[PDB]
Amino acid sequence: NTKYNKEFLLYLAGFVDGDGSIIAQIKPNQSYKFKHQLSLTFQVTQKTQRRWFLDKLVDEIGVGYVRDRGSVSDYILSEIKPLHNFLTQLQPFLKLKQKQANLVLKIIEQLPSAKESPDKFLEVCTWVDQIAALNDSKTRKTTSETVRAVLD
Amino acid sequence: NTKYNKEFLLYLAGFVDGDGSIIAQIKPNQSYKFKHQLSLTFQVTQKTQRRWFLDKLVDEIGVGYVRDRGSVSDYILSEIKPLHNFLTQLQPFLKLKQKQANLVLKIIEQLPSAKESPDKFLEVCTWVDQIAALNDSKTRKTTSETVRAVLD
DNA sequence: TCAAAACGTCGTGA
DNA sequence: GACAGTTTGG
DNA sequence: CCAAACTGTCTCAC
DNA sequence: GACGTTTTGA
Ligand SMILES: [Mg+2]
Ligand SMILES: [Mg+2]
Ligand SMILES: [Mg+2]
């Protein structure tokens, strides 16, 4: 469980607040018990000409990867354990996205317990609803209310 | 002549690298001896719903102001003396915009010299060219060579 | 004749 | 920036 | 059944 | 984000 230097986190927290995104998602998939996946992503987006900055991030955070879409790239961190360790440390330095971050940690910690009850799975889906409410979200489709219907 | 806190600077450098802009412009203006003004701007842009963040910048930096344009607002610092002092302290923490910041610092120092000599004035204009070359620049119009013409 | 503020908008890079 | 829909392989 | 990866795009907020 | 044009005020 990696310790990150505070100088790294202060800078990163400011950059993340600007160009980064903290994302909670409910993805319909029929292979899943509740017929949806809970997905959690930390990402930093940057123009591909600046990709080196994202590649350095991978080296610094020590986990995650960069993905290319044309003129733009993203650092992506998905795996739950590293994500928790990293967001825990970054959270206190965030200003704009700090609420989002603390909710993700909550969703993560409750994730096992949410695969039992349709009820707890919903309670956690409303937290997703919350993170989306904080983000500037124009494109969203699947919500805790989507899940609600399906479960009935 | 304010000394800024290092934690404040580290975070802000990150944010600036993400959402900020270090801008140099040659503004054609007929009231000027060389028929152009040399203009420097440090800005941070954010959605107006987040304007509180920008307001806190004014308080923290101690100088500058917030402007509104539609759905979006900007922290603006154009005052050359405060600007020099601020950027001098921010620059070593900048990863993406550090060269721009240094060019600005160099322009500000050389500005009195620029106002005497058309040759020196043109020289400083080439430094602003180099800032635009570093920024993701699209709508740029007036350049050092545009100035050179008018001078002849 | 200047420094700074005020106002306005393209082309993305988030 | 913040999603979407789809595939993979234990 | 699941975590995680892979792949694509809409509407801005820079 | 990164420019543009125009006006203000010593
Ligand atoms: Mg931003
Ligand atoms: Mg941005
Ligand atoms: Mg950026």
JSON list of C-alpha atoms in Angstrom, two decimals, chain A residues 35-119:
[
{"chain": "A", "resi": 35, "resn": "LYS", "atom": "CA", "xyz": [-28.17, -7.02, -13.80]},
{"chain": "A", "resi": 36, "resn": "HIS", "atom": "CA", "xyz": [-25.88, -3.97, -13.46]},
{"chain": "A", "resi": 37, "resn": "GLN", "atom": "CA", "xyz": [-22.20, -3.40, -12.68]},
{"chain": "A", "resi": 38, "resn": "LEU", "atom": "CA", "xyz": [-21.08, -0.75, -10.22]},
{"chain": "A", "resi": 39, "resn": "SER", "atom": "CA", "xyz": [-18.06, 0.85, -11.87]},
{"chain": "A", "resi": 40, "resn": "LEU", "atom": "CA", "xyz": [-15.67, 3.35, -10.28]},
{"chain": "A", "resi": 41, "resn": "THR", "atom": "CA", "xyz": [-13.03, 5.36, -12.15]},
{"chain": "A", "resi": 42, "resn": "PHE", "atom": "CA", "xyz": [-10.42, 8.00, -11.35]},
{"chain": "A", "resi": 43, "resn": "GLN", "atom": "CA", "xyz": [-9.18, 9.71, -14.51]},
{"chain": "A", "resi": 44, "resn": "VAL", "atom": "CA", "xyz": [-7.02, 12.61, -15.65]},
{"chain": "A", "resi": 45, "resn": "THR", "atom": "CA", "xyz": [-7.62, 13.77, -19.19]},
{"chain": "A", "resi": 46, "resn": "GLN", "atom": "CA", "xyz": [-4.99, 15.52, -21.31]},
{"chain": "A", "resi": 47, "resn": "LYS", "atom": "CA", "xyz": [-4.29, 16.35, -24.97]},
{"chain": "A", "resi": 48, "resn": "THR", "atom": "CA", "xyz": [-2.24, 13.57, -26.54]},
{"chain": "A", "resi": 49, "resn": "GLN", "atom": "CA", "xyz": [0.67, 15.88, -27.42]},
{"chain": "A", "resi": 50, "resn": "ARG", "atom": "CA", "xyz": [1.02, 16.13, -23.60]},
{"chain": "A", "resi": 51, "resn": "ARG", "atom": "CA", "xyz": [0.70, 12.39, -23.08]},
{"chain": "A", "resi": 52, "resn": "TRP", "atom": "CA", "xyz": [4.11, 12.20, -21.30]},
{"chain": "A", "resi": 53, "resn": "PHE", "atom": "CA", "xyz": [2.51, 13.95, -18.33]},
{"chain": "A", "resi": 54, "resn": "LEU", "atom": "CA", "xyz": [-0.04, 11.08, -18.15]},
{"chain": "A", "resi": 55, "resn": "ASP", "atom": "CA", "xyz": [2.71, 8.48, -18.61]},
{"chain": "A", "resi": 56, "resn": "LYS", "atom": "CA", "xyz": [4.64, 10.03, -15.72]},
{"chain": "A", "resi": 57, "resn": "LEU", "atom": "CA", "xyz": [1.46, 9.73, -13.59]},
{"chain": "A", "resi": 58, "resn": "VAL", "atom": "CA", "xyz": [1.45, 5.98, -14.18]},
{"chain": "A", "resi": 59, "resn": "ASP", "atom": "CA", "xyz": [5.05, 5.80, -12.96]},
{"chain": "A", "resi": 60, "resn": "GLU", "atom": "CA", "xyz": [4.31, 8.04, -9.95]},
{"chain": "A", "resi": 61, "resn": "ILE", "atom": "CA", "xyz": [1.04, 6.46, -8.81]},
{"chain": "A", "resi": 62, "resn": "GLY", "atom": "CA", "xyz": [2.57, 3.07, -9.61]},
{"chain": "A", "resi": 63, "resn": "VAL", "atom": "CA", "xyz": [-0.68, 1.60, -10.93]},
{"chain": "A", "resi": 64, "resn": "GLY", "atom": "CA", "xyz": [-3.23, 2.42, -13.65]},
{"chain": "A", "resi": 65, "resn": "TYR", "atom": "CA", "xyz": [-2.72, 3.07, -17.35]},
{"chain": "A", "resi": 66, "resn": "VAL", "atom": "CA", "xyz": [-3.08, 5.66, -20.08]},
{"chain": "A", "resi": 67, "resn": "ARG", "atom": "CA", "xyz": [-5.54, 5.25, -22.92]},
{"chain": "A", "resi": 68, "resn": "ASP", "atom": "CA", "xyz": [-5.58, 6.96, -26.27]},
{"chain": "A", "resi": 69, "resn": "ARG", "atom": "CA", "xyz": [-8.56, 8.41, -28.03]},
{"chain": "A", "resi": 70, "resn": "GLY", "atom": "CA", "xyz": [-7.32, 10.42, -30.98]},
{"chain": "A", "resi": 71, "resn": "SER", "atom": "CA", "xyz": [-6.21, 13.93, -30.09]},
{"chain": "A", "resi": 72, "resn": "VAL", "atom": "CA", "xyz": [-6.91, 13.22, -26.42]},
{"chain": "A", "resi": 73, "resn": "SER", "atom": "CA", "xyz": [-5.63, 10.74, -23.80]},
{"chain": "A", "resi": 74, "resn": "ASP", "atom": "CA", "xyz": [-6.56, 9.78, -20.23]},
{"chain": "A", "resi": 75, "resn": "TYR", "atom": "CA", "xyz": [-4.85, 8.37, -17.20]},
{"chain": "A", "resi": 76, "resn": "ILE", "atom": "CA", "xyz": [-7.27, 5.71, -15.86]},
{"chain": "A", "resi": 77, "resn": "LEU", "atom": "CA", "xyz": [-7.31, 4.16, -12.39]},
{"chain": "A", "resi": 78, "resn": "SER", "atom": "CA", "xyz": [-9.98, 1.51, -11.81]},
{"chain": "A", "resi": 79, "resn": "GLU", "atom": "CA", "xyz": [-8.76, -1.33, -9.58]},
{"chain": "A", "resi": 80, "resn": "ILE", "atom": "CA", "xyz": [-10.53, -0.85, -6.25]},
{"chain": "A", "resi": 81, "resn": "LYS", "atom": "CA", "xyz": [-7.71, -1.48, -3.76]},
{"chain": "A", "resi": 82, "resn": "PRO", "atom": "CA", "xyz": [-5.18, 0.93, -5.36]},
{"chain": "A", "resi": 83, "resn": "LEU", "atom": "CA", "xyz": [-8.02, 3.37, -6.05]},
{"chain": "A", "resi": 84, "resn": "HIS", "atom": "CA", "xyz": [-9.00, 3.42, -2.36]},
{"chain": "A", "resi": 85, "resn": "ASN", "atom": "CA", "xyz": [-5.38, 3.83, -1.17]},
{"chain": "A", "resi": 86, "resn": "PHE", "atom": "CA", "xyz": [-4.84, 6.67, -3.64]},
{"chain": "A", "resi": 87, "resn": "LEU", "atom": "CA", "xyz": [-8.11, 8.61, -3.16]},
{"chain": "A", "resi": 88, "resn": "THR", "atom": "CA", "xyz": [-7.80, 8.34, 0.61]},
{"chain": "A", "resi": 89, "resn": "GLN", "atom": "CA", "xyz": [-4.48, 10.20, 0.35]},
{"chain": "A", "resi": 90, "resn": "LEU", "atom": "CA", "xyz": [-5.58, 12.73, -2.29]},
{"chain": "A", "resi": 91, "resn": "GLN", "atom": "CA", "xyz": [-8.97, 13.49, -0.72]},
{"chain": "A", "resi": 92, "resn": "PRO", "atom": "CA", "xyz": [-7.80, 15.93, 1.97]},
{"chain": "A", "resi": 93, "resn": "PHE", "atom": "CA", "xyz": [-6.09, 18.15, -0.61]},
{"chain": "A", "resi": 94, "resn": "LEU", "atom": "CA", "xyz": [-9.06, 18.34, -3.03]},
{"chain": "A", "resi": 95, "resn": "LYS", "atom": "CA", "xyz": [-11.37, 21.37, -3.13]},
{"chain": "A", "resi": 96, "resn": "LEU", "atom": "CA", "xyz": [-13.76, 21.00, -6.07]},
{"chain": "A", "resi": 97, "resn": "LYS", "atom": "CA", "xyz": [-13.87, 17.17, -6.34]},
{"chain": "A", "resi": 98, "resn": "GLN", "atom": "CA", "xyz": [-13.37, 16.24, -2.65]},
{"chain": "A", "resi": 99, "resn": "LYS", "atom": "CA", "xyz": [-17.04, 15.37, -2.06]},
{"chain": "A", "resi": 100, "resn": "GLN", "atom": "CA", "xyz": [-16.96, 13.05, -5.06]},
{"chain": "A", "resi": 101, "resn": "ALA", "atom": "CA", "xyz": [-13.81, 11.39, -3.75]},
{"chain": "A", "resi": 102, "resn": "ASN", "atom": "CA", "xyz": [-15.16, 10.72, -0.26]},
{"chain": "A", "resi": 103, "resn": "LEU", "atom": "CA", "xyz": [-18.31, 9.15, -1.73]},
{"chain": "A", "resi": 104, "resn": "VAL", "atom": "CA", "xyz": [-16.29, 6.77, -3.91]},
{"chain": "A", "resi": 105, "resn": "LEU", "atom": "CA", "xyz": [-14.38, 5.62, -0.82]},
{"chain": "A", "resi": 106, "resn": "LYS", "atom": "CA", "xyz": [-17.76, 5.03, 0.86]},
{"chain": "A", "resi": 107, "resn": "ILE", "atom": "CA", "xyz": [-19.10, 3.06, -2.13]},
{"chain": "A", "resi": 108, "resn": "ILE", "atom": "CA", "xyz": [-15.88, 1.03, -2.17]},
{"chain": "A", "resi": 109, "resn": "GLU", "atom": "CA", "xyz": [-16.02, 0.17, 1.53]},
{"chain": "A", "resi": 110, "resn": "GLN", "atom": "CA", "xyz": [-19.69, -0.89, 1.25]},
{"chain": "A", "resi": 111, "resn": "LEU", "atom": "CA", "xyz": [-19.28, -2.77, -2.04]},
{"chain": "A", "resi": 112, "resn": "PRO", "atom": "CA", "xyz": [-19.19, -6.29, -0.60]},
{"chain": "A", "resi": 113, "resn": "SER", "atom": "CA", "xyz": [-22.27, -5.63, 1.54]},
{"chain": "A", "resi": 114, "resn": "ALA", "atom": "CA", "xyz": [-24.13, -4.25, -1.49]},
{"chain": "A", "resi": 115, "resn": "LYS", "atom": "CA", "xyz": [-23.98, -7.56, -3.37]},
{"chain": "A", "resi": 116, "resn": "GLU", "atom": "CA", "xyz": [-26.31, -9.14, -0.76]},
{"chain": "A", "resi": 117, "resn": "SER", "atom": "CA", "xyz": [-29.48, -7.09, -0.71]},
{"chain": "A", "resi": 118, "resn": "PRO", "atom": "CA", "xyz": [-31.31, -5.51, -3.63]},
{"chain": "A", "resi": 119, "resn": "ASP", "atom": "CA", "xyz": [-31.86, -2.91, -0.89]}
]
